[PDB]
Amino acid sequence: PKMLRWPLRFVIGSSDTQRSLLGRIGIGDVLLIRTSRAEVYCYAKKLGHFNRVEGGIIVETLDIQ
């Protein structure tokens, strides 16, 4: 019925990759972060922004409906 727990991802950035890169990517390679983000995601839903502070993360928004 209802959903109990929600898988959150704290995203600090993203890069649009031409699928042709996988699999040239290997261990020791570097992947550039082209767009800096600081967003909370649950699946494809962006819930809000967070901030990387001294001892962890503080979340601002969390808009859930």
Partner: protein, 196 residues
């Protein structure tokens, strides 16, 4: 903060990433890449038992002065205050890196409160920021702000001029080996003085 501790790969500009994002491991093997932990460990050492520095006072970890007081007690009282567990004048490696992360964080927030150092710090790339933090470690925020003309040349990216001028200092005259490593870092913007 966490971003000050990051490993820095001092590739010059421009990067030629594959499809704008992928730098291959084989391309990176040419570069010597470290973090500021690795840098100040080379200049100041890493010790897990209390010792007396050259100065010579009670110190611990990476350059962490405990007391100028000659009493090993109280040197131990501030070491203990620092870790939060009863160390009998003996810390672990993790505690040392924790103490280091705190000491760097304090150094950077010091630089940023200083009207002379902040503009220069803000203008520099991350490898040369490490060099500035290095100097703050060695001689304090106020002492580094005294390098008026060098700091201005660093801000204007006059790297060769700044390196020539820094060589005329007391700092260089007194601790030449370390000074030359830090000045090499300003001149080149790479960690190469730390390859050994």
């Amino acid at each position: 903060g966490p971003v000050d501790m990051l490993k820095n790969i001092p590739i010059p500009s421009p990067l030629s990433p594959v499809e704008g994002i992928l730098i291959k491991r084989k391309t990176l093997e040419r570069y010597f890449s470290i973090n500021i932990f690795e840098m100040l460990r080379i200049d100041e050492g890493l010790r897990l038992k209390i010792y007396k520095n050259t100065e010579g006072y009670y110190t611990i970890g990476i350059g962490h002065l405990l007391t100028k007081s000659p009493s090993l007690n109280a040197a131990k009282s501030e070491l203990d205050k620092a870790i939060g567990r009863n160390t009998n004048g003996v810390i672990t490696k993790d505690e040392a890196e924790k103490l280091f992360n705190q000491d760097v964080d304090a150094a950077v927030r010091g630089i940023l409160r200083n009207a002379k150092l902040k503009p220069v710090y803000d203008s520099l790339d991350a490898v040369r920021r490490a060099a500035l933090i290095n100097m703050v470690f060695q001689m304090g925020e106020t002492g580094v702000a005294g390098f008026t003309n060098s700091l201005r040349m660093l801000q204007q990216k006059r790297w060769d001029e700044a390196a020539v001028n820094l060589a005329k200092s007391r700092w260089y005259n007194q601790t030449p080996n370390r000074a030359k490593r830090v000045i090499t870092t300003f001149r080149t913007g790479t960690w190469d003085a730390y390859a050994a």
